């Protein structure tokens, strides 16, 4: 198992490798081979070109058997120039050939994470700020892309080139040259790395201060009226100014440290240059080496250290990239609390009854909410579930849609344990109008059609009509194509709840749940929407969970929860007659509304 | 000055005083030092290939192995040291200049910030925090990168190009000179046209990226709804199509970079082939040494090294100049509401308020006040009410002079508020607006905001007067509790009490309640009405309200209709008159009856 290993960069890359070599595609695998071939051609080329330059100088200084020297030297100079152009061509062709592969690999990584995020439990409460998440994901995407590019196109070729230079220097010089350049590369890498750790710290402090200065400015600008009301302009300016100075100080330190890195790098490189060239000319002095060899060695060294001129940034980005990617893999690895059992049959609803069979449940194991809740909802009846503050009624919907499983006991629909069926069929059987309905950032029509995957215009129109929002939509300038939600037209609470009703009408489920559906609405809106809700509950099993008892008094039967168990059951009149918990709640709520009514 | 072609040149010319302050002489010293490093660095990089040329010449005018070794050694060492010194000079120039660059862009930012505070309210300052922040982040990055590339990439390259032209002129060709000049012209032109194309592709890619990301985020933030409709596969397919559109665009954009690099390499290497072939030919005729080949090759590669980035540099310098011109456009934008020259301070000895024939609208095609006149006596509790078209929602904004009347005038005490300093005018006014805002700071900072040097004792007294002191006392950090986001979230009543406390710290003679209770629930509203009445104690108070029962105890009620004063009097006189106020009263009472009925 690759997962059974040390949690480092090597493991992360090893996990990423199958994305780069799909074994699903074969058009992409070809592209990868082609890209590798371009790396090889490009290296062969850049290694070959300095020999051409060397021969040209040799022809000019040892015209003994390289005649006519003019023709020979010209030929080699053209070979050198053509070589430079060719090296660039091969490099860009490898990038171009590979790009599709990279984009596909990262797209598939992202898709796997996205799917897993939808599979994971509700208790991670993914409802947070849009801008924060977006900024983070933008940052991570850029990060992983840069990492991938630098590993494949900067680090790998440099390793190939470095080994080649070692062999070629070995076969033709020194070997003191080989040890000098290897020591040089080691010094260079170590220096760059240690300086880069320091620079990355300074960069983090800089960025933090920048965010603070910007936040002060933005808070001020979005609060222009308040700033005016209190004549606080100068105060705000001074307050931005101090933060902006703290940022400028940190920025100066951060940028300066780059100068220190460049100077260190140049010191190492140029010491090696001085030594190698001195050694080469000395070798010439003894008749061992040609003058062309000087040009050859100098060229080999500058070509070698060219990609390493970015090593600081390369190091910072590959590191951050590996961290960001390991985070992706940690999500994909996180285990799924609620899964279909192996080979789960579809739930088959012929008679839509609902049974809670001795249900024990809580969100967290240190706080049990339901203590053995049992009840039976008849097929086609309209039932309500009510209780006081600790009753646990707010769990019913979440259990029924299997956002969570019972700790003990079970829930059945049509005599079938919902824990043993596919989640998709289970949810196909259920409609819900929740307390707070949320709209996608899309058109109102898209939002209504969302109730069913292939929903036609007629179905949407019919539901909008059934939810009595059709007229409201007709009066919108852009009608069904009116963008709603954030970044869009603002709907009232009643209008959103009507869009939700319309969604469930599109879905047409056999069992429908009103989950505190009217609790966020004002009194008149609540009363208006109740006739609509009653009409849509027509030939379905309906379960309404409500705080205000009068809104559910017309139910076929009412289930009263107390302390996570079923305390009372029956019609509204039977419950008033029993003079128990429901009667007390009813009396209290009526008194409350009477008192509120007194304050006119 | 501003009277110019409005191009990159004008923007840069405007920016120059920021780099050469004439306020700061240390920064000027720094600029001079940076320039000296530019010149030393160039002298160095121009000199080093001559050293390399000599080393080769010494090994080739070697009849034998006579003092060529010492000379060649000396010259290669000069070459390596020259390289290191060039890098040292470049990095020291950056290091010397950095403080100057940072101070210049800071002062530009501060000037923009100050002017934005001077500009009109109607610039619709209400947006997303994340959007403006993203825009400002992008823009600062843009201006910094532009500044760095202009000073350190383009300018030294111009210096070097002129130097290389002269040197090639004096020592070669002159065909060499025309060849390199032609190369550079073709190079710049090619890079520019390809870059315009690439920038279009980049913009499309960015848009598609934003769309795929927005789909993923809207999905995750709607996790419950997706579960409710069992819509996971659907959302996956929807993210996937967008992500493919993005990938196709990313492939095109990145590939076009390869096309740019190849075009550039073609130009550079044609020039290389020609220059070196011609130099070798000059050698064959005894005109040029073999060192000259190495010399020319080095000069050309050094010259074209900074131009290796020219596409990015061009894209960036261009965007930066645009963003900076935007900055200058705001600084230039004219101020709608200004103090008259030598405007006196407002002196409130008796805090009366007069609207004298006020004609006003936010836009000249929609008049709201049509000649509004009324007098508010000093120290009275007055309410302003009206139906849908009355214009009462303009009063607060006019009184604080966020706008001027089109016709007529507003007086406080006996003085036209248009002829006094704005600061003194606002110093006389308190407001509790409908939607109260908290800064992202402590509760104490938020209350203390009412007056510039407000002490903790003052903050305490105001918190007490607003009846929020106990709530603060039960907080662990009390007044040092952070509020706003990400901070403790306050109820509506708690927020309005903070606003009230803020105004108490200011302690103004005239106090405005501008729909102060309209966002509050009934119970909260009734609670806050006693605090508000108490806080109105020795001030001139003006309450603009929708719900009449909340203001019925006022000394007098001004009823506006169609932007004029229709009715005036106490709640009882107004019910007796059986006019517009009586009708509004009856209607509102009937509504509360209907709501109560359900
Ligand atoms: N030809 C294209 C530009 C090609 C290009 O973008 N090349 C680079 C960007 S260089 S941008 C990076 C560069 N180097 C560094 O920042 C190195 C700093 C330190 N030495 C370290 O090791 O990190 C820099 O910013 N220098 C500042 C300056 O010279 O003024 C790249 O993306 N990949 C390199 C490759 O694969 O070939 C064009 O004309 O626009
Ligand atoms: N911009 C490319 C896209 C391809 C690319 O890879 N470009 C380079 C440009 S680096 S350009 C580097 C330059 N840096 C600086 O000016 C000083 C910062 C110093 N390099 C450091 O490392 O600290 C800068 O503008 N910012 C540095 C930073 O924010 O990290 C890159 O490697 N990444 C950016 C990208 O993908 O577009 C294009 O033109 O197509
Ligand atoms: C594609 C690989 C290119 C290999 C280039 C080989 C360079 C040979 C170096 C010449 C050796 C110098 N000398 C005169 C001492 O023999
Ligand atoms: C906070 C970590 C969770 C991030 C997981 C999000 C995965 C889908 C988003 C990928 C976006 C791809 N992009 C930016 C190129 O469009
Ligand atoms: C999978 C391709 C793109 C996905 C975007 C990357 C995710 C953002 C990084 C997650 C958190 C980063 N980190 C480690 C700083 O927390
Ligand atoms: C309409 C947008 C106008 C934006 C101008 C606002 C300038 C405020 C200063 C922001 C500077 C932030 N910084 C430089 C520290 O990153
Ligand atoms: C230095 C670059 C500034 C160039 C500004 C030129 C704009 N213009 C006139 C071409 O439109
Ligand atoms: C330290 C840098 C301070 C400079 C602040 C400049 C912010 C630039 C915002 C420009 C955005 C203009 N626009 C509309 C084109 O986006």
């Amino acid at each position: 198992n690759p997962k059974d290993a040390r949690h480092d960069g090597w493991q992360t890359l090893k996990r990423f490798l199958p994305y780069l070599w799909p074994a699903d595609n074969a058009v992409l695998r070809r592209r990868v081979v082609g890209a590798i071939l371009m790396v090889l051609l490009g290296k062969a080329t850049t290694l070959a070109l300095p020999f051409a330059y060397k021969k040209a100088v040799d022809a000019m200084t040892l015209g003994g058997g390289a005649q006519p020297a003019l023709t020979v030297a010209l030929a080699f100079v053209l070979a050198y120039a053509l070589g430079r152009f060719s090296g660039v061509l091969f490099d860009n062709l490898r990038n171009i050939v590979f790009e599709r592969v990279g984009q596909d690999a990262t797209r598939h990584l992202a898709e796997n994470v996205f799917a897993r995020l939808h599979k994971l439990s509700l208790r991670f409460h993914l409802a947070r700020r849009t801008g924060e998440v977006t900024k983070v994901i933008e940052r991570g995407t850029k990060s992983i892309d840069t990492m991938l590019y630098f590993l494949l196109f900067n680090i790998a070729p440099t390793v190939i080139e470095l080994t080649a230079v070692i062999v070629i220097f070995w076969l033709n010089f020194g070997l003191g040259l080989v040890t000098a350049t290897i020591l040089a590369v080691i010094a260079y890498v170590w220096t760059t790395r240690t300086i880069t750790e320091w620079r990355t710290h300074l960069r983090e402090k800089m960025n933090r201060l920048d965010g603070q200065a910007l936040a002060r400015a933005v808070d001020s600008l979005l609060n222009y009226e308040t700033v005016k009301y209190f004549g606080a302009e100068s105060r705000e300016e001074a307050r931005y100014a101090s933060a902006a100075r703290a940022y400028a100080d940190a920025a100066v330190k951060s940028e300066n440290s780059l100068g220190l890195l460049n100077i260190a790098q140049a010191l190492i490189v140029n010491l090696l240059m001085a030594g190698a060239m001195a050694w080469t000319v000395y070798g010439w002095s003894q008749g061992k080496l040609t003058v062309g060899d000087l040009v050859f060695v100098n060229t080999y060294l500058t070509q070698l250290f060219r990609p390493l001129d970015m090593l600081g940034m390369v190091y910072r980005t590959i590191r951050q990239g590996l961290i960001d990617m390991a985070e992706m893999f940690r999500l994909i690895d996180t285990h799924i609390e609620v899964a279909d059992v192996p080979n789960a049959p579809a739930l088959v609803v012929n008679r839509p009854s609902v049974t809670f069979d001795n249900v024990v449940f809580g969100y967290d194991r240190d706080r049990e909410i339901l203590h053995g809740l049992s009840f039976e909802v008849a097929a086609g009846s309209r039932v309500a579930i009510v209780g006081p503050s600790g009753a646990g009624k707010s769990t019913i919907a979440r259990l029924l849609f299997r956002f969570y499983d019972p700790w003990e006991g079970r829930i059945l629909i049509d005599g079938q344990d919902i824990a043993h069926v596919t989640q998709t069929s289970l949810r196909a059987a259920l409609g819900i109008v929740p307390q707070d309905s949320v709209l996608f950032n899309d058109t109102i029509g898209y939002n209504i059609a969302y109730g069913r995957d292939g929903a036609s215009r007629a179905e949407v129109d019919a539901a909008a009509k059934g939810a009595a929002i059709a007229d409201f939509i007709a009066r919108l300038p852009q009608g069904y194509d009116t963008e709603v939600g954030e970044r869009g037209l603002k709907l009232s609470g009643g209008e959103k709840q009507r869009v939700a009703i319309a969604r469930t009408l599109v879905k047409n489920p056999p069992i429908l749940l009103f989950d505190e559906a009217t609790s966020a609405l004002d009194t008149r809106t609540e009363q208006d929407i109740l006739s609509t809700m009653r009409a849509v509950a027509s030939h379905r099993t309906t379960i309404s969970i409500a705080h205000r008892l009068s809104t559910i008094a017309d139910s076929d039967t009412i289930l009263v929860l107390d302390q996570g168990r079923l305390a009372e059951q029956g019609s509204h009149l039977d419950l008033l007659r029993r003079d128990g918990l429901y009667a007390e709640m009813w009396a209290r709520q009526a008194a409350e509304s009477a008192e509120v009514s007194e304050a006119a």
Side-chain angles (χ1 to χ4, degrees), chain A:
Chain A
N1 209 316
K3 276 167 195 191
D4 282 319
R6 179 186 188 172
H7 207 266
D8 55 353
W10 296 111
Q11 193 190 38
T12 301
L13 288 188
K14 266 156 212 161
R15 284 196 72 169
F16 193 60
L17 275 177
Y19 291 79
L20 295 173
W21 194 254
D24 211 1
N25 199 327
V27 185
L28 294 189
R29 300 199 302 277
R30 285 204 273 279
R31 283 191 179 258
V32 174
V33 173
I36 284 163
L37 265 74
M38 302 308 294
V39 166
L40 299 187
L41 280 198
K43 287 305 173 187
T45 292
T46 68
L47 293 169
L49 66 83
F51 170 72
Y53 190 3
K54 157 206 159 73
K55 292 313 275 179
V57 173
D58 277 353
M60 295 159 80
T61 62
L62 275 45
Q67 284 285 314
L70 175 55
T71 291
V72 172
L74 278 178
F76 275 119
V77 156
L78 274 28
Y80 165 83
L82 178 85
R84 294 181 69 232
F85 170 75
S86 284
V88 176
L89 175 63
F90 291 143
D91 284 10
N92 286 269
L93 282 177
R94 82 176 171 219
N95 294 356
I96 292 179
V97 172
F98 193 81
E99 188 72 29
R100 164 69 59 191
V101 179
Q103 291 294 341
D104 285 19
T106 58
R107 173 167 71 79
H108 286 121
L109 185 55
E111 294 180 4
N112 294 347
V113 175
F114 185 65
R116 161 98 3 170
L117 288 180
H118 278 298
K119 285 178 208 268
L120 294 182
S121 182
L122 172 66
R123 66 194 306 142
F124 290 109
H125 287 311
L126 302 159
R128 298 183 180 180
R129 291 294 198 74
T130 304
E132 306 296 357
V133 174
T134 303
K135 188 143 101 192
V136 170
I137 296 172
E138 266 170 340
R139 193 195 43 75
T141 293
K142 184 81 188 185
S143 192
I144 287 166
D145 280 342
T146 309
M147 174 229 41
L148 188 67
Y149 174 85
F150 282 145
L151 262 181
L152 294 189
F153 302 143
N154 179 284
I155 296 299
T158 293
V159 175
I160 289 173
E161 164 150 38
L162 173 58
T163 66
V165 168
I166 290 172
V167 173
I168 290 177
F169 275 10
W170 171 260
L171 296 178
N172 299 337
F173 306 95
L175 65 91
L177 192 56
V178 165
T179 70
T181 83
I182 292 181
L183 287 173
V185 171
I186 290 165
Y188 190 96
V189 173
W190 183 91
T191 298
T192 299
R193 178 181 184 160
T194 75
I195 299 177
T196 290
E197 287 168 347
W198 172 53
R199 299 213 342 111
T200 299
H201 166 266
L202 291 171
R203 178 188 260 256
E204 282 163 15
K205 173 164 191 194
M206 178 191 180
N207 287 340
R208 168 172 72 254
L209 287 176
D210 182 35
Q212 280 164 32
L214 191 32
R216 273 183 170 184
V218 170
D219 208 38
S220 175
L221 294 173
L222 301 200
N223 287 343
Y224 175 88
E225 291 194 283
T226 310
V227 174
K228 289 299 171 189
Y229 286 151
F230 300 96
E233 294 84 356
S234 299
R235 225 161 328 145
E236 293 290 337
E237 289 161 29
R239 174 181 198 225
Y240 172 74
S242 68
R245 285 178 221 115
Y247 163 75
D249 292 340
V252 165
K253 287 180 197 105
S254 180
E255 307 280 36
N256 282 2
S257 72
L258 178 52
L260 298 191
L261 171 68
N262 288 343
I263 296 167
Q265 281 169 342
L267 186 65
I268 295 168
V269 169
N270 286 302
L271 284 178
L272 172 71
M273 196 68 49
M277 299 180 74
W279 180 246
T280 295
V281 55
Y282 171 73
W284 163 82
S285 273
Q286 303 164 141
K288 306 186 168 89
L289 312 170
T290 74
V291 61
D293 286 337
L294 181 60
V295 155
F296 184 87
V297 169
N298 167 280
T299 290
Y300 257 53
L301 288 186
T302 69
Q303 291 185 147
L304 173 69
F305 280 91
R306 188 170 304 111
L308 292 188
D309 192 42
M310 270 166 126
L311 187 58
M313 166 195 320
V314 162
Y315 177 83
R316 167 173 54 84
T317 60
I318 286 179
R319 178 182 167 276
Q320 188 56 52
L322 289 173
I323 292 173
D324 291 350
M325 189 181 269
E327 185 58 40
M328 290 317 81
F329 284 135
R330 179 187 79 74
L331 301 183
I332 285 177
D333 292 341
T334 295
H335 288 78
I336 291 155
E337 181 173 330
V338 176
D340 292 357
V341 302
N343 313 123
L347 172 68
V348 180
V349 191
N350 177 85
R351 196 59 166 131
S353 55
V354 178
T355 309
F356 269 52
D357 172 21
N358 196 33
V359 171
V360 179
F361 169 78
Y363 300 109
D364 292 292
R365 288 292 176 147
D366 65 351
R367 188 172 62 88
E368 195 179 311
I369 298 171
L370 301 182
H371 303 297
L373 178 57
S374 287
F375 65 77
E376 255 290 327
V377 178
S381 48
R382 300 174 46 245
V383 324
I385 305 177
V386 301
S389 74
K393 70 188 181 289
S394 86
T395 65
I396 307 295
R398 288 175 179 217
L399 284 165
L400 201 46
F401 268 90
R402 207 184 167 214
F403 281 70
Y404 305 86
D405 274 322
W407 298 353
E408 248 169 82
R410 48 179 198 158
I411 299 161
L412 319 167
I413 291 173
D414 204 351
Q416 294 151 80
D417 190 340
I418 64 166
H420 301 342
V421 301
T422 63
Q423 279 170 90
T424 59
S425 62
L426 158 66
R427 304 191 180 124
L430 306 169
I432 184 160
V433 176
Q435 172 174 2
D436 303 310
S437 285
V438 181
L439 295 174
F440 293 105
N441 290 324
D442 218 318
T443 69
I444 192 164
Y446 174 94
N447 275 288
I448 297 166
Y450 200 85
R452 198 180 68 76
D453 200 335
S456 74
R457 285 165 159 268
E459 282 162 295
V460 164
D461 283 333
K465 180 185 192 96
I469 203 181
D471 290 347
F472 162 74
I473 302 185
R475 305 182 264 96
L476 299 169
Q478 294 178 2
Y480 286 99
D481 300 297
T482 305
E483 291 281 345
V484 293
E486 282 173 335
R487 308 162 62 191
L489 177 64
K490 282 198 183 237
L491 298 187
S492 70
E495 283 151 17
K496 279 174 288 187
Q497 293 295 107
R498 298 194 178 270
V499 177
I501 293 175
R503 284 199 186 134
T504 74
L505 281 176
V506 161
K507 183 176 190 166
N508 200 27
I511 297 152
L512 174 59
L513 264 50
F514 295 116
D515 186 54
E516 303 287 339
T518 72
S519 297
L521 311 174
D522 68 61
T523 302
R524 200 181 305 105
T525 301
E526 177 177 65
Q527 302 301 320
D528 279 351
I529 203 176
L530 287 169
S531 35
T532 297
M533 291 169 37
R534 193 161 312 111
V536 312
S538 54
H539 287 94
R540 314 164 194 284
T541 298
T542 295
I543 301 163
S544 310
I545 299 142
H547 177 274
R548 172 180 302 282
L549 302 182
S550 61
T551 72
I552 55 84
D554 60 350
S555 306
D556 293 349
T557 177
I558 292 153
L559 306 162
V560 185
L561 304 196
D562 199 30
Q563 297 301 316
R565 292 196 143 246
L566 179 68
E568 291 175 11
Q569 200 175 354
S571 84
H572 165 76
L573 291 174
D574 299 338
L575 292 177
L576 291 191
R577 294 169 64 194
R578 286 180 72 268
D579 196 27
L581 171 56
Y582 181 94
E584 199 207 320
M585 296 182 71
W586 181 267
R588 168 151 55 246
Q589 259 168 28
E592 282 181 355
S593 61
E595 290 169 5
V596 168
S597 175
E598 179 70 14

